[PDB]
RNA sequence: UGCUUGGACUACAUAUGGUUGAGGGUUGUA
RNA sequence: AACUCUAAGCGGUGGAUCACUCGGCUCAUGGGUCGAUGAAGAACGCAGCAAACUGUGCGUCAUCGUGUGAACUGCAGGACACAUGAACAUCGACAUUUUGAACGCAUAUCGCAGUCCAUGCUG
RNA sequence: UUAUAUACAACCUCAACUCAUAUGGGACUACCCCCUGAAUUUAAGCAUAUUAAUUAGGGGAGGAAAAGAAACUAACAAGGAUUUUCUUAGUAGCGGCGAGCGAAAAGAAAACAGUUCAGCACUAAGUCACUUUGUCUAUAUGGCAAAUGUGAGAUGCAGUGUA
RNA sequence: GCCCGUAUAACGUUAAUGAUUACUAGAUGAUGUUUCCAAAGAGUCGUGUUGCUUGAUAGUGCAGCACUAAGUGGGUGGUAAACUCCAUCUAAAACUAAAUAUAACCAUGAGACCGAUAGUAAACAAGUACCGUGAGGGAAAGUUGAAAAGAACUCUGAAUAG
RNA sequence: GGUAUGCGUAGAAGUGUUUGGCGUAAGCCUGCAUGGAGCUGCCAUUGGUACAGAUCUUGGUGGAUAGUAGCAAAUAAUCGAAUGAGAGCCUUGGAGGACUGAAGUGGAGAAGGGUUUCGUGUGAACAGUGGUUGAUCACGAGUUAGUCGGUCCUAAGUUCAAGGCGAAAGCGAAAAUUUUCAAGUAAAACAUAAUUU
């Protein structure tokens, strides 16, 4: 940490702002099939990496 | 819109086009022998096509 | 000649694959003399080719190049037939003066294989099985 | 000395992410994208890893300008012109 | 007419199993490479597993049309012809008859020049088979499959044939009525007329 | 049947009813007229609109009963009336769906519009009375 | 003048002119 | 009655059977469409309540004209600016951040420039 | 104009330009094109054969590509551009004369389309392209002349003429 | 025959068949006869010889090397070599829509195909969750009923519950 | 594909079975009980056709045990008050016993982590025991610079102008040869002067 750059400031906000659980109404659709998300991420159990 | 309509009539009557307004159509036929250019035919090739026409004939019986 | 890239110790496999220092290409230099040109020159076409000169440390051509879209050039229709599309870059597809002959091409029965086509698409060609819709 | 006496000793990051890629490749010492090539002016390719390329293959997401081309040049690139009200 | 049908010559060797195998108590069949993702093992590659190939499959080229003859056709249309008449065996194969008028029946040459076919049926109900092909309108019904997703609905029992010589508006025409299905003469095509 | 360019498979001829756009669905969700209508236009078929008059003919209740609409459930493949009802337990009543394929049309509103539809269905079917 | 804020610009290989040309290369007029 | 043996009922772990399939692969006829005017792939920024898939590019879940002719919808809220178009699809108009074949020198650095006008303050 | 003592004019090789004005590497690949050329396998082993003038092979194209108007056949009561299919034929020879390889004109079928270059004599550069100025219009890197404004062009442009 | 559809067809837009008019560009033959000139591709043919390669064998072509051509000549005629002829073509220059190839891309239908341990690696938020740093490996998971009418409210527990 | 005016929401396919029966036998026929939309018999053909097995693939599930194996290293926890539906803990705060001993189990820095840091709120998996607090979720906020630092300079070395070679890609490369391949320098005619590889 503490010495990043400005691509791993900008990536590690998109591997943040997709760490929210499913929209909390949006299971009310037509044809709904999303319980709780695919790519969900703790940080012990799931890497980042990429 | 007529920030761009003003331009290309009074880019009109010009040649050297500006280039975000030079019909982008594609590839292939852009920077390959224009076609009104590319039928010029050669003399020696518009005399065997005078004189000796196709003729709409049925030869039959 | 022409060296066979194996390092210093000659190819595994077989001895019909061993021998090296004598070993000859196939394309002949008046049709790599135009690759030669038309890769470092992103520009232009081939035409033709001819020698003028040997000794001993290179051979060493002359190639014709043609502009393609010199505003002249396509007003100049006899020898419009160069720059349609399918002519350009005439040194790799072999249909040059040199590239022409280099893979065996004529007729009939000193060539009768190069005739499928081009040259080894005879050997694409002959091995082609026909299971019918009706036998 | 590989049982796990060398699973702390192993932190320094040996493969960055490179520029046109997305995917850790560029190995940092000698300068080379490990799957495509940035600085070789070609998406270094291969015909043996058949299954790998459907994933670099034209026509795995965006294909901005390559979807208009589609439906223009279907209609036969009619540029210029633009529609009247129907009679 | 016969189409074709395989298994797409690849399938299941989208691969790389190479035997991680014998041994340490597990089995010989090769095994998918690296994993974390529920494939390592878990077996392509070998036809009694979840992934691989099934049996040899069927490559495309087969013996999947028949080649007949030139004198067995027509030996067989000959051979249909003469089952038209002789009328016995024909109510013994279907087609209640109990009200035609003649066997082999042959129509007037003026019912060629027919045209809505509302007007035709008059002509069958006055022929005493309209009430035979309401035999047909029982027999439709559904395919015992497989058939009903394969887009072969069913279909029912073949009725009339009528023999047209020369057309005026009988295919035009008949083509609605359920199982009648018509012919010119010159062709007689086989298994229009005797089916099965 | 005739013409080679329609098809009639079972995925595909539910491929483009399902999953066909959301414009053309209007021009799916049609109703018979009454059959009094039938002499004032003499055209069979018409598509519903969101406040129309609509009439139930087989359904649970088979239909004795002018009613409004409030709108049409277009991915739904259905359309309310304001007086079929049903509550839960809570009170709270629905409007439960019929679909247009067994209702019936009583009343249409006669805008600008949708006079012109009338005279597009106009002669056409009266064309098909010549031959 | 210098600051900050906009734009336009400013690859290389390269073809045919354009300009300025460099040459005990080759002459010519002196 | 403990327990163990054995049938069935019945509850229970389980997802096999059969059915059903907005999908797969095969069969065959159609057409030429690949960028120096910025392609292909990525990174992000997206919207009212939004992570994705899909859509896009500071005009950001859509977009001028067009066509057809009233809605999307879990909900709030705006519409009915149908009647001078809802919402679709079509799509010609205009747009196209960021990077590539990097067309500034150049990237484990949003870093270093250079020319010229415009536009603000020095003054 | 060269004791290496100056100009000017050409020429000749030859530069530099934020000049003008424009063309190209790249993506895909089934098919196609010139490339490079391996191996388990078969011979009951293997080394020439085979896998094969083959998978990576990558440089190139397109709606066609290459071929194509014979320095061919055949040897006959002759034929006659190129490509694909049926057959020639699993036959001719190549073969550790081992395993195994392997064509072909000729016969019939689709389609059919033949001709510019070079070079005597072809006998007033009669040529070609920019430029600017107008004609004529058009989303033309455009049609008519002109100044004959350049330059290209005799180290050869054009017309007629070609196995 | 409830609904679009599908059936012949009408509606409509775009081409596409140009009689004429104009402008621009050119042209008199083929025809037999003999007078005069009938000019023809230069390190390439071809031989030697090495090395891949061929159905090709005292050689198929394609190549590097040495050679180095003739003008009534040059190849070519499947056994080499002269030697006599004969026949048929004229090397090293250059272009052309077709009938042929199509797991691509784009819109299109089709049946003796599979029925979620099958079928493309995935019917769905499959090249995504996921592990390897890497090259890359890639799975699992479809099917409440006609309608969401999804179980109000009462009792019990602190609750989902019961 | 032919066929039986074939049965089918007045219950069709499989699933069970202490109903009944036919064959030598594989196999059906039949009754009841689920079940909710399609099915079989004769005769022509036929395809990826019947499974106890392959140290067989995949998915449940046993006995041992479904309570055995063992959760034993780092001195060692304790009464009372809370609150809590419920506390040996952790969750606290009151005492006060002993550890870590300043080459710490202490305070802050690097690589790597990537929202863990903080408040607020909490039911179930999560914390190989509990759970009222947690590195789990729910829900909110939270990282400010002219001086700290990346940024400039260059080090071993990437071989990264086109002299070169390779069939092309590109080159397990002290690319020192590459008109001027000079940075230029307030400059002077008449390649600005000796200068820069």
């Given at each position: 940490?503490?010495?990043?750059?400005?691509?791993?400031?900008?990536?590690?906000?998109?591997?943040?702002?997709?760490?929210?659980?499913?929209?909390?109404?949006?299971?009310?659709?037509t044809?709904?099939?999303?319980?709780?998300?695919?790519?969900?991420?703790?940080?012990?159990?799931?890497?980042?990496?990429? | 819109?007529?920030?761009?309509?003003?331009?290309?009539?009074?880019?009109?009557?010009?040649?050297?086009?500006?280039?975000?307004?030079?019909?982008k159509?594609?590839?292939?036929?852009?920077?390959?022998?224009?076609p009104?250019?590319?039928?010029?035919?050669?003399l020696?090739?518009?005399?065997?096509?005078?004189?000796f026409?196709?003729?709409?004939?049925?030869?039959?019986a | 000649?022409?060296?066979?890239?194996?390092?210093?110790?000659?190819?595994?496999?077989?001895?019909?694959?061993?021998?090296?220092?004598?070993?000859?290409?196939?394309?002949?230099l008046?049709?790599?003399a135009?690759?030669?040109?038309?890769?470092?020159?992103?520009?232009?076409?081939?035409?033709?080719?001819?020698?003028?000169?040997?000794?001993?440390?290179?051979?060493?051509?002359?190639?014709?190049?043609?502009?393609?879209?010199?505003?002249?050039?396509?007003?100049?229709?006899?020898?419009?037939?160069?720059?349609?599309?399918?002519?350009?870059?005439?040194?790799?597809?072999?249909?040059?003066?040199?590239?022409?002959?280099?893979?065996?091409?004529?007729?009939?029965?000193?060539?009768?294989?190069?005739?499928?086509?081009?040259?080894?698409?005879?050997?694409?060609?002959?091995?082609?099985?026909h299971?019918?819709?009706?036998? | 000395?590989?049982?796990?006496?060398?699973?702390?000793?192993?932190?320094?990051?040996?493969?960055?992410?490179?520029?046109?890629?997305?995917?850790?490749?560029?190995?940092?010492?000698?300068?080379?994208?490990?799957?495509?090539?940035?600085?070789?002016?070609?998406?270094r390719?291969?015909?043996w890893?058949?299954?790998?390329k459907?994933?670099?293959?034209?026509?795995?997401?965006?294909?901005?300008?390559?979807?208009?081309?589609?439906?223009?040049?279907?209609?036969?690139?009619?540029?210029?012109?633009?529609?009247?009200?129907?009679? | 007419?016969?189409?074709?049908?395989?298994?797409?010559?690849?399938?299941?060797?989208?691969?790389?199993?190479?035997?991680?195998?014998?041994?340490?108590?597990?089995?010989?069949?090769p095994?998918?490479?690296?994993?974390?993702?529920?494939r390592?093992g878990?077996?392509?590659?070998?036809?009694?597993?979840?992934?691989?190939?099934?049996?040899?499959?069927?490559?495309?080229?087969?013996?999947?049309?028949?080649?007949?003859?030139?004198?067995?056709?027509?030996?067989?249309?000959?051979?249909?012809?003469?089952?038209?008449?002789?009328?016995?065996?024909?109510?013994?194969?279907?087609?209640?008859?109990?009200?035609?008028?003649?066997?082999?029946?042959?129509?007037?040459?003026?019912?060629?020049?027919?045209?809505?076919?509302?007007?035709?049926?008059?002509?069958?109900?006055?022929?005493?088979?309209?009430?035979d092909?309401?035999?047909?309108?029982?027999?439709?019904?559904?395919?015992?499959?497989?058939?009903?997703?394969?887009?072969?609905?069913?279909i029912?029992?073949?009725?009339?044939?009528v023999?047209?010589?020369?057309?005026?508006?009988?295919?035009?025409?008949?083509?609605?009525?359920?199982?009648?299905?018509?012919?010119?003469?010159?062709?007689?095509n086989?298994?229009?007329?005797?089916?099965? | 049947?005739?013409?080679?360019?329609?098809?009639?498979?079972?995925?595909?001829?539910?491929k483009?009813?399902?999953?066909?756009?959301?414009?053309?669905?209007?021009?799916?969700?049609?109703?018979?007229?009454?059959?009094?209508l039938?002499?004032?236009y003499?055209?069979?078929?018409?598509?519903?609109?969101?406040?129309?008059?609509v009439?139930?003919?087989?359904?649970?209740?088979?239909?004795?009963?002018?009613?409004?609409?409030?709108?049409?459930?277009?991915?739904?493949?259905?359309?309310?009336?304001?007086?079929?009802?049903?509550?839960?337990?809570?009170?709270?009543?629905?409007?439960?769906?019929?679909?247009?394929?067994?209702?019936?049309?009583?009343?249409?509103?006669?805008?600008?519009?949708?006079?012109?539809?009338?005279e597009?269905?106009?002669?056409?079917?009266?064309?098909?009375?010549?031959?």
């Amino acid at each position: 940490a503490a010495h990043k750059s400005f691509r791993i400031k900008q990536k590690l906000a998109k591997k943040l702002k997709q760490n929210r659980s499913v929209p909390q109404w949006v299971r009310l659709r037509t044809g709904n099939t999303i319980r709780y998300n695919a790519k969900r991420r703790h940080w012990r159990r799931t890497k980042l990496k990429l | 819109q007529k920030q761009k309509e003003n331009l290309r009539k009074v880019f009109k009557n010009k040649k050297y086009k500006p280039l975000d307004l030079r019909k982008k159509k594609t590839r292939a036929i852009r920077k390959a022998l224009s076609p009104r250019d590319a039928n010029r035919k050669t003399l020696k090739e518009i005399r065997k096509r005078s004189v000796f026409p196709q003729r709409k004939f049925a030869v039959k019986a | 000649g022409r060296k066979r890239p194996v390092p210093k110790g000659c190819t595994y496999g077989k001895p019909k694959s061993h021998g090296v220092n004598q070993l000859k290409p196939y394309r002949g230099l008046q049709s790599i003399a135009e690759e030669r040109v038309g890769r470092r020159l992103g520009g232009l076409r081939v035409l033709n080719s001819y020698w003028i000169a040997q000794d001993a440390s290179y051979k060493y051509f002359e190639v014709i190049l043609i502009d393609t879209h010199h505003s002249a050039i396509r007003r100049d229709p006899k020898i419009n037939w160069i720059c349609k599309h399918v002519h350009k870059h005439r040194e790799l597809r072999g249909l040059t003066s040199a590239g022409k002959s280099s893979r065996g091409i004529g007729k009939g029965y000193r060539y009768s294989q190069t005739i499928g086509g081009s040259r080894r698409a005879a050997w694409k060609r002959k091995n082609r099985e026909h299971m019918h819709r009706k036998r | 000395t590989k049982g796990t006496t060398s699973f702390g000793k192993r932190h320094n990051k040996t493969h960055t992410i490179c520029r046109r890629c997305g995917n850790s490749s560029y190995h940092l010492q000698k300068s080379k994208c490990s799957q495509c090539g940035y600085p070789a002016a070609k998406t270094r390719s291969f015909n043996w890893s058949r299954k790998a390329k459907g994933r670099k293959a034209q026509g795995t997401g965006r294909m901005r300008y390559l979807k208009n081309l589609r439906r223009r040049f279907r209609n036969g690139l009619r540029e210029g012109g633009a529609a009247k009200k129907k009679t | 007419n016969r189409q074709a049908y395989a298994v797409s010559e690849l399938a299941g060797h989208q691969t790389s199993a190479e035997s991680w195998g014998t041994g340490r108590a597990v089995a010989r069949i090769p095994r998918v490479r690296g994993g974390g993702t529920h494939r390592s093992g878990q077996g392509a590659f070998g036809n009694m597993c979840r992934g691989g190939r099934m049996f040899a499959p069927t490559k495309t080229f087969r013996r999947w049309h028949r080649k007949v003859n030139v004198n067995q056709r027509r030996y067989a249309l000959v051979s249909a012809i003469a089952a038209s008449g002789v009328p016995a065996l024909v109510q013994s194969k279907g087609h209640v008859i109990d009200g035609v008028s003649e066997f082999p029946l042959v129509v007037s040459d003026e019912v060629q020049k027919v045209q809505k076919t509302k007007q035709a049926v008059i002509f069958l109900r006055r022929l005493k088979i309209w009430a035979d092909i309401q035999k047909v309108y029982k027999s439709q019904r559904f395919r015992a499959g497989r058939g009903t997703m394969r887009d072969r609905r069913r279909i029912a029992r073949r009725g009339p044939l009528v023999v047209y010589d020369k057309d005026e508006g009988l295919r035009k025409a008949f083509r609605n009525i359920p199982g009648i299905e018509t012919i010119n003469v010159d062709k007689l095509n086989l298994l229009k007329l005797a089916p099965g | 049947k005739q013409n080679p360019f329609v098809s009639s498979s079972r995925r595909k001829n539910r491929k483009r009813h399902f999953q066909a756009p959301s414009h053309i669905r209007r021009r799916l969700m049609s109703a018979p007229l009454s059959k009094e209508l039938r002499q004032k236009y003499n055209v069979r078929s018409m598509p519903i609109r969101r406040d129309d008059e609509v009439q139930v003919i087989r359904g649970h209740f088979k239909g004795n009963q002018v009613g409004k609409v409030v709108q049409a459930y277009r991915k739904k493949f259905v359309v309310y009336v304001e007086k079929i009802q049903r509550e839960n337990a809570n009170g709270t009543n629905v409007y439960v769906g019929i679909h247009p394929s067994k209702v019936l049309i009583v009343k249409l509103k006669l805008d600008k519009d949708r006079k012109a539809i009338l005279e597009r269905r106009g002669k056409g079917r009266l064309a098909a009375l010549g031959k």
